[PDB]
Enzyme design. Sequence first.
Site, PDB file in Angstrom:
ATOM      1  N   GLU A 257     -39.941   3.055   0.342  1.00  0.00           N
ATOM      2  CA  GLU A 257     -38.721   3.010   0.324  1.00  0.00           C
ATOM      3  C   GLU A 257     -38.178   4.640   0.414  1.00  0.00           C
ATOM      4  OE1 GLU A 257     -37.495   1.562  -3.523  1.00  0.00           O
ATOM      5  OE2 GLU A 257     -38.473   3.060  -4.907  1.00  0.00           O
TER       6      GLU A 257
ATOM      7  N   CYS B 215     -24.968   8.920  -5.452  1.00  0.00           N
ATOM      8  CA  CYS B 215     -24.528  10.280  -5.570  1.00  0.00           C
ATOM      9  C   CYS B 215     -23.185  10.571  -5.861  1.00  0.00           C
ATOM     10  CB  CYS B 215     -24.963  11.160  -4.501  1.00  0.00           C
ATOM     11  SG  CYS B 215     -26.858  11.280  -4.115  1.00  0.00           S
TER      12      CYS B 215
ATOM     13  N   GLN C 193     -37.095  -3.985  -2.191  1.00  0.00           N
ATOM     14  CA  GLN C 193     -38.818  -3.784  -2.048  1.00  0.00           C
ATOM     15  C   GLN C 193     -39.259  -5.263  -2.299  1.00  0.00           C
ATOM     16  OE1 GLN C 193     -40.774  -1.737  -1.451  1.00  0.00           O
ATOM     17  NE2 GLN C 193     -40.601   0.319  -2.453  1.00  0.00           N
TER      18      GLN C 193
ATOM     19  N   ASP D  13     -43.805   4.536  -3.250  1.00  0.00           N
ATOM     20  CA  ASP D  13     -42.525   5.285  -3.100  1.00  0.00           C
ATOM     21  C   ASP D  13     -43.066   6.680  -2.845  1.00  0.00           C
ATOM     22  OD1 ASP D  13     -40.597   7.173  -4.355  1.00  0.00           O
ATOM     23  OD2 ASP D  13     -39.310   5.648  -4.534  1.00  0.00           O
TER      24      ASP D  13
ATOM     25  N   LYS E 121     -29.947  -0.420   0.926  1.00  0.00           N
ATOM     26  CA  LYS E 121     -30.743   0.700   0.306  1.00  0.00           C
ATOM     27  C   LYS E 121     -30.171   2.006   0.481  1.00  0.00           C
ATOM     28  CE  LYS E 121     -34.347   3.578  -0.829  1.00  0.00           C
ATOM     29  NZ  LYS E 121     -34.388   5.048  -0.352  1.00  0.00           N
TER      30      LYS E 121
ATOM     31  N   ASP F 216     -28.420   4.373  -2.602  1.00  0.00           N
ATOM     32  CA  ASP F 216     -29.253   5.544  -2.735  1.00  0.00           C
ATOM     33  C   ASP F 216     -28.676   6.899  -2.429  1.00  0.00           C
ATOM     34  OD1 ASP F 216     -31.825   6.427  -3.849  1.00  0.00           O
ATOM     35  OD2 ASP F 216     -32.487   7.017  -1.891  1.00  0.00           O
ATOM     36  N   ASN F 217     -28.100   6.695  -1.280  1.00  0.00           N
ATOM     37  CA  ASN F 217     -27.416   8.050  -0.577  1.00  0.00           C
ATOM     38  C   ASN F 217     -25.911   8.039  -0.930  1.00  0.00           C
ATOM     39  OD1 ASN F 217     -29.886   8.360   0.660  1.00  0.00           O
ATOM     40  ND2 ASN F 217     -29.082   7.547   2.670  1.00  0.00           N
TER      41      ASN F 217
ATOM     42  N   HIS G 224     -31.796  17.834  -0.576  1.00  0.00           N
ATOM     43  CA  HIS G 224     -33.251  18.031  -0.261  1.00  0.00           C
ATOM     44  C   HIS G 224     -33.793  18.667  -1.795  1.00  0.00           C
ATOM     45  CE1 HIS G 224     -37.074  17.566   0.870  1.00  0.00           C
ATOM     46  NE2 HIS G 224     -37.536  18.807   1.202  1.00  0.00           N
TER      47      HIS G 224
ATOM     48  N   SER H 278     -32.047  -0.878  -4.397  1.00  0.00           N
ATOM     49  CA  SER H 278     -33.305  -0.169  -3.622  1.00  0.00           C
ATOM     50  C   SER H 278     -34.447  -1.412  -4.164  1.00  0.00           C
ATOM     51  CB  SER H 278     -33.801   1.029  -4.294  1.00  0.00           C
ATOM     52  OG  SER H 278     -32.578   1.838  -3.970  1.00  0.00           O
TER      53      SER H 278
ATOM     54  N   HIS I   8     -29.632   7.930 -10.735  1.00  0.00           N
ATOM     55  CA  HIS I   8     -28.918   6.935 -10.207  1.00  0.00           C
ATOM     56  C   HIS I   8     -28.884   5.753 -11.338  1.00  0.00           C
ATOM     57  CE1 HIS I   8     -28.508   8.716  -6.363  1.00  0.00           C
ATOM     58  NE2 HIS I   8     -29.698   7.823  -5.763  1.00  0.00           N
TER      59      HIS I   8
ATOM     60  N   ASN J 130     -36.277   2.070   3.467  1.00  0.00           N
ATOM     61  CA  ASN J 130     -35.486   3.399   3.412  1.00  0.00           C
ATOM     62  C   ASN J 130     -34.225   3.099   4.118  1.00  0.00           C
ATOM     63  OD1 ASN J 130     -35.216   5.837   2.282  1.00  0.00           O
ATOM     64  ND2 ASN J 130     -35.394   6.894   4.450  1.00  0.00           N
TER      65      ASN J 130
ATOM     66  N   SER K 213     -41.821  11.690 -14.194  1.00  0.00           N
ATOM     67  CA  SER K 213     -40.611  11.032 -14.186  1.00  0.00           C
ATOM     68  C   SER K 213     -40.722   9.744 -15.065  1.00  0.00           C
ATOM     69  CB  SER K 213     -40.490  10.279 -12.517  1.00  0.00           C
ATOM     70  OG  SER K 213     -41.417   9.545 -12.226  1.00  0.00           O
TER      71      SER K 213
ATOM     72  N   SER L 272     -47.015   5.732 -11.562  1.00  0.00           N
ATOM     73  CA  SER L 272     -45.741   6.562 -11.197  1.00  0.00           C
ATOM     74  C   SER L 272     -46.229   7.343  -9.897  1.00  0.00           C
ATOM     75  CB  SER L 272     -45.642   7.466 -12.351  1.00  0.00           C
ATOM     76  OG  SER L 272     -44.206   8.030 -12.165  1.00  0.00           O
TER      77      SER L 272
ATOM     78  N   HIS M 193     -41.998   5.600  -9.874  1.00  0.00           N
ATOM     79  CA  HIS M 193     -41.208   6.157 -11.191  1.00  0.00           C
ATOM     80  C   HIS M 193     -41.498   5.083 -12.144  1.00  0.00           C
ATOM     81  CE1 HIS M 193     -40.158   9.723  -8.659  1.00  0.00           C
ATOM     82  NE2 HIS M 193     -39.328   8.859  -7.759  1.00  0.00           N
TER      83      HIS M 193
HETATM   84  N1  LIG Z   1     -29.952  13.885  -4.693  1.00  0.00           N
HETATM   85  C1  LIG Z   1     -30.373  12.508  -4.781  1.00  0.00           C
HETATM   86  O1  LIG Z   1     -30.636  11.851  -5.745  1.00  0.00           O
HETATM   87  C2  LIG Z   1     -30.564  11.966  -3.280  1.00  0.00           C
HETATM   88  C3  LIG Z   1     -30.592  10.825  -3.012  1.00  0.00           C
HETATM   89  C4  LIG Z   1     -30.485  10.320  -1.635  1.00  0.00           C
HETATM   90  C5  LIG Z   1     -30.657  11.590  -0.739  1.00  0.00           C
HETATM   91  N2  LIG Z   1     -30.758  12.694  -1.048  1.00  0.00           N
HETATM   92  C6  LIG Z   1     -31.349  13.723  -0.184  1.00  0.00           C
HETATM   93  O2  LIG Z   1     -30.039  14.407   0.420  1.00  0.00           O
HETATM   94  C7  LIG Z   1     -30.235  14.881   1.709  1.00  0.00           C
HETATM   95  C8  LIG Z   1     -29.377  14.282   2.776  1.00  0.00           C
HETATM   96  O3  LIG Z   1     -29.134  13.191   2.535  1.00  0.00           O
HETATM   97  P1  LIG Z   1     -28.225  12.196   3.625  1.00  0.00           P
HETATM   98  O4  LIG Z   1     -28.737  10.715   3.338  1.00  0.00           O
HETATM   99  O5  LIG Z   1     -26.831  12.600   3.267  1.00  0.00           O
HETATM  100  O6  LIG Z   1     -28.656  12.839   5.064  1.00  0.00           O
HETATM  101  P2  LIG Z   1     -27.891  12.961   6.337  1.00  0.00           P
HETATM  102  O7  LIG Z   1     -28.670  13.227   7.433  1.00  0.00           O
HETATM  103  O8  LIG Z   1     -27.013  11.264   6.386  1.00  0.00           O
HETATM  104  O9  LIG Z   1     -26.879  14.009   6.306  1.00  0.00           O
HETATM  105  C9  LIG Z   1     -27.052  15.362   6.177  1.00  0.00           C
HETATM  106  C10 LIG Z   1     -26.059  15.838   6.678  1.00  0.00           C
HETATM  107  O10 LIG Z   1     -26.261  17.335   6.642  1.00  0.00           O
HETATM  108  C11 LIG Z   1     -25.705  18.014   7.817  1.00  0.00           C
HETATM  109  N3  LIG Z   1     -26.609  19.340   8.109  1.00  0.00           N
HETATM  110  C12 LIG Z   1     -27.640  19.602   8.214  1.00  0.00           C
HETATM  111  N4  LIG Z   1     -27.842  20.869   8.247  1.00  0.00           N
HETATM  112  C13 LIG Z   1     -26.742  21.653   8.045  1.00  0.00           C
HETATM  113  C14 LIG Z   1     -26.248  22.966   7.696  1.00  0.00           C
HETATM  114  N5  LIG Z   1     -27.094  23.981   7.895  1.00  0.00           N
HETATM  115  N6  LIG Z   1     -24.840  22.973   7.173  1.00  0.00           N
HETATM  116  C15 LIG Z   1     -24.007  21.780   7.155  1.00  0.00           C
HETATM  117  N7  LIG Z   1     -24.545  20.743   7.543  1.00  0.00           N
HETATM  118  C16 LIG Z   1     -25.698  20.497   7.816  1.00  0.00           C
HETATM  119  C17 LIG Z   1     -26.219  17.250   8.901  1.00  0.00           C
HETATM  120  O11 LIG Z   1     -25.273  17.495  10.045  1.00  0.00           O
HETATM  121  C18 LIG Z   1     -25.694  15.932   8.194  1.00  0.00           C
HETATM  122  O12 LIG Z   1     -24.737  15.089   8.776  1.00  0.00           O
HETATM  123  C19 LIG Z   1     -31.444  14.401   1.925  1.00  0.00           C
HETATM  124  O13 LIG Z   1     -32.655  15.554   1.719  1.00  0.00           O
HETATM  125  C20 LIG Z   1     -31.779  13.260   1.220  1.00  0.00           C
HETATM  126  O14 LIG Z   1     -33.401  13.011   0.928  1.00  0.00           O
HETATM  127  C21 LIG Z   1     -30.898  12.973  -2.405  1.00  0.00           C
END
Ligand SMILES: NC(=O)c1ccc[n+]([C@@H]2O[C@H](COP(=O)([O-])OP(=O)(O)OC[C@H]3O[C@@H](n4cnc5c(N)ncnc54)[C@H](O)[C@@H]3O)[C@@H](O)[C@H]2O)c1
Lengths: 462, 462, 462, 462
Positions: free
Chosen positions: D188, D227, D395, D128, D218, D222-223, D333, D391, D383, D213, D79, D74, D51
Amino acid sequence: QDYVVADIALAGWGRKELNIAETEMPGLVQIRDEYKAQQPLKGARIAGSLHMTIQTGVLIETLKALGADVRWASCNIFSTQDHAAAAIVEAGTPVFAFKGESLDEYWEFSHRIFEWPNGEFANMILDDGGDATLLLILGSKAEKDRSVIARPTNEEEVALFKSIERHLEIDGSWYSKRLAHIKGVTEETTTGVHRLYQMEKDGRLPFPAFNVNDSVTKSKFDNLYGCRESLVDGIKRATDVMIAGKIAVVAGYGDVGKGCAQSLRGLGATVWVTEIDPICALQAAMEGYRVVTMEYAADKADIFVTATGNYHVINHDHMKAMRHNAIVCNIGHFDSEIDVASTRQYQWENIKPQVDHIIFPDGKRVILLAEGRLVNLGCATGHPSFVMSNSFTNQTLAQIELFTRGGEYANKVYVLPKHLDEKVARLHLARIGAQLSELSDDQAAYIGVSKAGPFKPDHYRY
Amino acid sequence: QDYVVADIALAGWGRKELNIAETEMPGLVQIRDEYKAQQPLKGARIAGSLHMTIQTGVLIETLKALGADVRWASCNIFSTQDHAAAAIVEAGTPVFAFKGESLDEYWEFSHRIFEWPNGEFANMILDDGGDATLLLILGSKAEKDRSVIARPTNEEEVALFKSIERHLEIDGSWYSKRLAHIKGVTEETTTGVHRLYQMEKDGRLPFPAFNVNDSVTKSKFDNLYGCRESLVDGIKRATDVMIAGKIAVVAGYGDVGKGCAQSLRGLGATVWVTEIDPICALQAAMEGYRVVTMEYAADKADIFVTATGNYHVINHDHMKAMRHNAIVCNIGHFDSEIDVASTRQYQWENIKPQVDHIIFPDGKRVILLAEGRLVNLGCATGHPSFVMSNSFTNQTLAQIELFTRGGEYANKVYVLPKHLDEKVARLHLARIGAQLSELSDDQAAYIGVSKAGPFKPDHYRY
Amino acid sequence: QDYVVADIALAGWGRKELNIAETEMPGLVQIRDEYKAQQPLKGARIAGSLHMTIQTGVLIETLKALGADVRWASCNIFSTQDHAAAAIVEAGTPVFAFKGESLDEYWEFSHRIFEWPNGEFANMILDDGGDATLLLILGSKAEKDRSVIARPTNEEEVALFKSIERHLEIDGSWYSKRLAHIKGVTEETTTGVHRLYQMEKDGRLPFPAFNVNDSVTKSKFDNLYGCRESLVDGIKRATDVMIAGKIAVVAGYGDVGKGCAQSLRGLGATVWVTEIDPICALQAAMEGYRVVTMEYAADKADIFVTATGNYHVINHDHMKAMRHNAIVCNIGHFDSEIDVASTRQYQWENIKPQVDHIIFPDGKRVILLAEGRLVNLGCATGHPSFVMSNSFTNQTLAQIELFTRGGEYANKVYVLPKHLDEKVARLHLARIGAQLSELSDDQAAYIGVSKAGPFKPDHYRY
Amino acid sequence: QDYVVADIALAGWGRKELNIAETEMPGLVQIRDEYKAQQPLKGARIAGSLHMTIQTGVLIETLKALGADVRWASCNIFSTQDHAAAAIVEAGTPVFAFKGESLDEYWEFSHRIFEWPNGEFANMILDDGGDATLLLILGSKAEKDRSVIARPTNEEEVALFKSIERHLEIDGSWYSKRLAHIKGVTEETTTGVHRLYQMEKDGRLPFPAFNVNDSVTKSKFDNLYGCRESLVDGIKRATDVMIAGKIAVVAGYGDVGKGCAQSLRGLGATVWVTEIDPICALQAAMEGYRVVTMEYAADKADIFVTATGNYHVINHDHMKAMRHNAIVCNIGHFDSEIDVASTRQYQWENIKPQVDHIIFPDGKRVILLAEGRLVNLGCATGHPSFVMSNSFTNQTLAQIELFTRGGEYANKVYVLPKHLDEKVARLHLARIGAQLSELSDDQAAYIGVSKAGPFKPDHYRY
Ligand SMILES: NC(=O)c1ccc[n+]([C@@H]2O[C@H](COP(=O)([O-])OP(=O)(O)OC[C@H]3O[C@@H](n4cnc5c(N)ncnc54)[C@H](O)[C@@H]3O)[C@@H](O)[C@H]2O)c1
Ligand SMILES: NC(=O)c1ccc[n+]([C@@H]2O[C@H](COP(=O)([O-])OP(=O)(O)OC[C@H]3O[C@@H](n4cnc5c(N)ncnc54)[C@H](O)[C@@H]3O)[C@@H](O)[C@H]2O)c1
Ligand SMILES: NC(=O)c1ccc[n+]([C@@H]2O[C@H](COP(=O)([O-])OP(=O)(O)OC[C@H]3O[C@@H](n4cnc5c(N)ncnc54)[C@H](O)[C@@H]3O)[C@@H](O)[C@H]2O)c1
Ligand SMILES: NC(=O)c1ccc[n+]([C@@H]2O[C@H](COP(=O)([O-])OP(=O)(O)OC[C@H]3O[C@@H](n4cnc5c(N)ncnc54)[C@H](O)[C@@H]3O)[C@@H](O)[C@H]2O)c1
C-alpha cells in the site's frame, strides 16, 4: 471569390472582436511569438473543419503566423459567426462558412477546403467531429465501390452521398489522391476520436492521428472549468432566478457535474448530486454534497441540471412529480438526457426563446430550458475564450508535432504527449500571473524526472 | 381612460410574467393569504411611486388583495416595463407610466396618482426615492411662497417647477388640500429616507414615515444578496469573460462589496479589496482577501468593481495605468464612482450596447461597462424577484402598520419595528424549505424574550 | 513578597511564551510604540481582575509600557497559567493568582489588588466579569448595613461575605474610601456589563464605565472568529474524527453559530442549522445551509454543536434518538445548553479526559465532550492570541480614554466610541499586511464623514 | 507465549478503542457482514507487517472474521499502540510489536510472522513499506550468495543483515522454503510498490503482487482528504495560531498540496502555492490561488507548508529571509523537504515537544514543527479512521482477490482492478448516507458499461 461567406462587409466588426479575443487567448498568441523565427508550419497546407467563430479565428491566424497556408470550413451549419468569417477572409484565408447554411452547402464547403489552387494539395487536417476526415475516407471507398453511397438512411447522408457522386464525376479518383497527401490529422472531439479508432481497427488509417480530446488541459477546460464558468449564466439569462437558498440537483459528478456543483454552491444553493459510480459519489460526499436518487430529488428540488452523458436521467415521472415552476436544464450530452419527447403530449407555452412552460395534466408547470438541449450554448454563449484557448493551443501543438515530426509516429491514434500537454498549460501561465518554479539538477534526479519534463507518470490523475 | 401606458395590448404577456414572478415572491403571496379575511387595507387609498416592473405589479396586486384602492406611477422615466403596466391596468389599477417617458410626463404622472375620483383623496404614500412625497411638500410651500420653485438648478427641477406652477393656476391650494389627507409614508431608498429625516429636522413632516431602507431584511437582500446574485451576470453578458484565475479588485467592503467579493471568489478569481474603514478592511482580511490600495491595484488587476458609494474611486490616472483590456465597472452609486468624464478626451469605440473601448494615446484600451453607471442594471436585469420580494414585503407590512396603527406613532421617521422585520424573513422561509423552531416558555424567559419575538435587542447587528 | 504565585521559578518559561505571544498580538504591541512618548497612563494605578494567562500578560505589560502601575488577580480560580503569573511578577508587577486556588484565596486576592502600598489607592479598574467591582460596591454597603452579607446562599457567597467581614475588622470603611478613588471601570463580559447597568439603575454607579463587550471588533473576534478558529480543533483533539461527509447540526446562527457553520463547511461536512429567529434562519439559508428542527436532526446528524446561549436545546429525547457514537458538544453558554443532568441516570464510561460515553437503556452510545461545558476551552485551548489581542486592545484604549478624558463622561455605562473601535481594527492591519486607504477632502465631504473617522453611523451593522 | 507486546494488561483499554473505531471504519465492518457466510479467506495464512495501531486492529479482525489465520508485526519501531497490540493478542492473534522497540527486535519480529506452528507456512503477505517482502527475497538470495548481506550502508541494514545471518545458521534454506509458499502480496505504500516493480523488472517476483497505493480510493483518502483533515490540526496543537488573515504558502499542488490549500483557505488564510508542474500550477490558479516562487514567498508568508515530495524546497536562505516567528512545517516526504541540517549551526530553543525555535544571528526566530518531519504525525495523530478505512478496505479486497483468484494472475505487479476500487467506495456510502443510483439496461448499453461496473475506462482521472 475563393470563399463563401454571408457578407464580407462584416469584416471590420469581426476584426475588432478578434483583437479583443486575442487578449483572452494567451496560449495562441504566445505560440505566435515563440515560433515566429522557426516558422514550423511553412509548407503546411491545412484543411480545417471547426466552428467558424471568433475564437477559431484566432486559431486560424496563429496557424498562419507560424507559416501555414489554410482553407477553412465550419463543422456545424449553425455555429458560424458571420463577422468572424468575413474578417478571416479579408485577412487572406479562404473560408467556406455561413450561419444557416444548408446540408448541401455544408458538404460542398467540406470539399472546398480540400480543393487547393495551382495543382496543390492539403497535407494536414485539423478536425472537430471528424466530418472532413470522413469525407476523404468514404469518398475513397466510393471510388472502388459505389454501393457505399447507394442507400442513404437520413438527411445528412442524402446530402453527403450526393456531393460525393458529384465530385466523382469531376475526377473518378478525386478522394484517394487527396488522401495520399495527408501527413496527419488532429481531432478534438469524442465522436471524431471514436471514428479514428474505428478506422485504425479497420486498417483504414493511412496517417498518424492525435487525439487531443483526452489531454489533461483540454479535458479540464472543456469539461470542468468551461461549464463551471457558464452554467449559472445560462440559467440566469433564461430565468433571472435567485440561486441562493434553492435546492439544485446535479445528475452526474464527472468533470462537468463537478464544475456545476461548484458554481451552484458558490452562490449559496443547497447542492444535491446523483450518481451511479460509487467513487464519484464518494468524491461528491467528501465535498459536503448530499448524494441522492432522482426519485428522491424529483418532488423536492428547485433546479435540475443533467450532466451524465446518459439517456433519460430526467424522465416523464420525475417531471410529473416536480414542484411548480421547477427549472429543468441539460449541460451534458447534446440531447436525450431529459425525456422531453414524453412531455410533447402536454400543453406547452413559450416564455421566450429557449424557454418554455410545460403544463401537466393537473396544471402544474415546469420551466424547461433550450428544449432539453445544451443550456450553456442555447441560453448563454458557450465557453469563454480562455477555455477555447486551451483547446486550440492543444490543436496547434498537435499540428506542429505531426507536420514537423510525424515521421516518428505510426499510422495510429495517439493521445497528445504529456510534454506538449504541459506546454499548453505553461503557455497560459503568464497571462494569469502564475510564476512557475524550476527544478535544480539534484531535485530532478531526486524525484526522477527531467528538468524540462514531463513531470508526472502517464497514469497520473491530477 | 384613467391611465397612461405605452400599449394596453401588452396586457396578456404581462399577466403571464406576473404569474411566473409570483412563485419567486412568496412574501407577497403569503401576505395575501394571511390577511385575506381581515382586509387590513380596506379604506386605504395608496398613491404609489415605484419602478413599474413585473415585480412591482405583484406588490400592487397584494395591496389590492388586502383591500387597498391604488393609483400608480413609476419613480424613473426608463424603468417601466410596458407589459407590466398594461397587465396592472387591465386588472383595474390606474397606472401612469411608460418606458422612455419625458420629465414633463413624469411629473404630470406624479400628480395623477394624487387625483382621485368621487371627491376622494389619497391617504397613504408608498414611495421610492421620495418624489411623490416631495411633490406635495414642495408644492404646498410654493402655494405661499413662489420663490421655492423659482430657481431651477436642473433639467429635472425645470420640469418639476413647471408642473407645480401649472397646477397652482388650476387651484392655488392643490397640494395643501391633498397633503392634509396623508396618514403616512413608507420609503425604501437612501435618498428618500435622507429627505424624510431632513423634513423631520425642519419640523416639516406632518405624518409618520417608515424608513424601510434600514430594515435588516431589506438592506441584506437589496445590498448584499442582490448584488452577489447579479454582479458576474452583468460582467458575463457584457464580456463573456473567464473569471477563474483573474485578479478582481472590489473597491468597498460594505454590504455591496461583501457580496461582490463573495461571488467573484466563488468562480475562482483572486479577490483584492480596497477600503477606508479599518473595521471593514479587517473583516475582508479575515475572509482571506488581500486589502490593497487602488494605486497598487491599478496596473495589476483584470477586473475592477466599484462598490464604495463614493467619488472618483477609480480616477484618470488609475485607468491610464491599467492593463490592456482590463474590465472596469460600477455596482455602487448611480454614477461618478469612476471618472468617466476624464476619458471623454480620448477616442472611444463602442463594442456593443453598454460596452465601450476607451483608447489611450499609447494604444492601450480599457473596457468600460454601462458607461460607469450600474452594471447590474445596465448589462443585466437588476435584482431577482426573491430579493425584491423582501423589499416589497417590507413596504407592505409598513403600509399595514401605518394605516391600521398610525395613531400610535408621532410625526417622525421610524425604522420598521423589529417584529415586522422578523415577519418579513419568516414569510420567506416556507418557499426555501427552512423550518423555524419555537421557543418554550422556559426558554423565552431564560433569554429574556417573548416567544413571538422580537428576539434581538435593537442594537443587534446580525 | 507582594505577590502570591504557584512558583516564581516558572518565570523563564513564562517570559519565552510572552515573547512568542507578542508577535500574535500586534494591537497591544503597537499601542506601546505609538503612546511611548506620551505615557498616557502615568499616574494610573490599575487594579486588574482578568484570567492570568500569557495573553493577559501581554496586556499587563502594555499598560506598564504606557506608564501604569498595576496590581493583578485572576477572575477565575482555574484559568491562571502559573508560568505567566511568575513571569509578570519577575518583571515587577504584583500578581495574586494561581491555578487551583480556593474560593477564600480568590476573594482575598481580589482585595490585594486594591491594597496599594505607601498610603496609595487604585484609581482604575480593569475587569472581566465584574467581581472586582462587585467587591467594592458590596463591601461599601456592608459598611452601612451588615445585613447584606448576613445570609449567604451558596459557596462563592460564604467566601465573599467572610472576606468582607475580615476587612471591615481592619478598617470599618475599608471599601468606601477605596471606591472614592476609582476614576473609571472598563468591563468586557456580558455578565459584568449587566451588573454595571443595574448599578446605574440603582443610582449606585459612582464613576463612568465602558462596556467593551459590545464593540464591533471585540464581539466579532470573541464570538465569530474565535469560535470559527477553534470548534473543529476541540472536536478533533477529543475524537480525531473525520469531518468531511458528516452531517453536522449547529443550534443557533448568531455570531458563534455563524462561525461554527463556516468552519464545518470548510472541511466538507454537510451543515444543518436550527434557529428560532427567522432573520438568522434566512441568513443561514442564503449560505446554502438547510434549516431544520432539532427533532428532525436528532436521529440523523453525526455531530451536534450548541451555540444558542439558551436552555436545553439538546434534550433527553434528542439524545435518546441519536445515532450510535453521535458526538455532542457545546460552544455556547457555559452550561445547560445540553441536558447532561438528565443523562446522569444512565451508565457513563470515560474515554479520556473531557470525553465520555453515555450508554442508553438500549445500548446505544453517545459521545459527549467536556461534559456539556465549553468544547473550545475543555478540549482545545480557547481563543488564539490574535483574537485576544482585539479584546485586550479594546480594554487598553478604554483605560486610556477614561483615565485621560473620563471627566468628559457621566457616571453611566457607555459602549466604546466608534472611533476607538475603528482604532482597534486599524492597530491590527499592519500585522496582516492590509493597506488601508485614505479619503481625500472631497471624498470625505461627499459621503459626509471626517477623514479621520468615524466612518459609519452608530446604527451600522457591518 | 506466541507474541511479544509491551503489556498484555492494556487489552481492555484497547478493546474499548477498537469498539469506537469500528463505527468510523464502515468499509471493514461491512466487509465482515457481506462475506461472513462465504469465509473467502479460509485457508489463508497471512503474514502482516503494518503499523500496529487501533485501526490496523480493525483490519486484523476483519481478516479473521473472513476466515484468515494471521500473525502480525509493525512496519515501524515507534508507530505501535501498545493497547491495540494487547487487545489483538488477547483476542487470539500473535503480535510482535511494541512502541519504541529496537531495530534488532524489529527484524526479529519480521521473522516471527513467518514462523507458523504445526508445520504450516504463511501463504499471503499484507505489507506496508515492503520489509516483510524484502526479508524473504533478500534472505533467499543470501542463501546462495552471502555477499548481498555483506556491505551494510546503514544502521537498519546492520540489523537486517545480522538477523539474516543469524537465521541462516539455524537453517541454510530458512527463507527459500517460506518464499515458495507465498501465493501473493498486497502493498500500500510508494516505497513498497517501487520495490515490487524493481523485482518484477529483474524477474525476481515469484508471485502476483497488488499495488493498492495507486487505487483511486486509496490515493484520494491517503493523500488528499487525509491531509486536508489534519494539516491545521497539527499546526494548532503545536502553536494555537490564528489562521485567518495569514499568508500561507504550500509548496506542491499535487494531491497533498491540493488538500492543504483547501483546508487553509477554509479558515480564511490567503493561500499561495509553488509548483514546478505547469499543469498543477494552472489548476491552482483556476481555484484562485496565486502561484509564486519560494524566493518570492520567503520574506512575506507567515506559514510555510511543504508538500512536494522533493529535496530542500525550503532551504537555508529562505529561512534566513523569513519573518520573525514564521511557522515552518512539512507534510510531504518523511524528511529533507526542509534543510533543517543547515540550521543546526544556530542556537535552537525548544518551545515544547516537536516545536522548536531556530535563532538566527540577527535575533530573528523561526518556529519549526516536528523538526521538519511530518507535522500531521508529529504534532497531531495522523489520518482519521474513515481515511484508514479506505486504505485497509483496499488491502482486504486485494487479499480476497489474490487468495481466491490468484491463479488468474501472472507474476507481476497489478494495480487493484477498477471494480474492486469501486467496491471500496461503495462500501463507504451507507455510513455517510450517500444513495447510489442504478443504471437501467438501456442506460448501461447507451454509455457502454455493465450495470455492475466498472463504470469508467482505465485511463479515467476522476
Ligand atoms: N504527510 C502525510 O501523512 C502524507 C500522506 C500521503 C502522502 N504524503 C507524501 O507527500 C508527498 C507528496 O505527495 P503527493 O501525493 O501530493 O505527490 P504528487 O506528486 O501528487 O505531488 C507532488 C507535487 O509537488 C510538486 N513539486 C515537486 N518538486 C517541487 C518543487 N521543487 N517545488 C514546487 N513543487 C514541486 C510536483 O510538481 C507535484 O505536482 C509524497 O512524498 C508523499 O509520500 C504524505
Ligand atoms: N455542455 C457542454 O458544453 C459540454 C462540454 C463538455 C462536455 N459535455 C458533455 O457532458 C457529458 C458529461 O461529460 P463529463 O466529461 O462530465 O463525463 P464523465 O463521464 O466524466 O461524467 C459523467 C458522469 O455521469 C455519471 N452517470 C452516468 N449515468 C448516470 C445516471 N443514470 N445517473 C447519475 N449519474 C450518471 C457517471 O458515473 C459519470 O461520473 C458528456 O456527454 C460530454 O460530452 C458537455
Ligand atoms: N448596484 C445596485 O443595484 C445597488 C444596490 C444596493 C446599493 N447600492 C449602492 O452601493 C453603494 C454602496 O452600498 P453599501 O450598502 O455597500 O454601502 P456601505 O456604506 O455599507 O459600504 C460602502 C463601503 O465603501 C467604503 N468606502 C467609501 N469610500 C471609499 C473609498 N474611497 N475607497 C475604498 N472604500 C471606500 C466604506 O468604508 C464602506 O465600508 C451605495 O451607493 C448604494 O446606494 C447599489
Ligand atoms: N464558547 C465560547 O468560547 C464563547 C465565546 C463567545 C460567546 N459565547 C457564548 O455563545 C452564546 C451565543 O453567543 P452569540 O454571540 O452567538 O449569541 P447570539 O444571540 O448572537 O446568537 C444566539 C442565537 O441562538 C438562537 N437561539 C436561541 N434559542 C434557540 C433555540 N432554542 N434553538 C435554536 N436557536 C436558538 C438565537 O435566535 C440567536 O440567533 C452566548 O452564550 C455567548 O456567551 C461563547
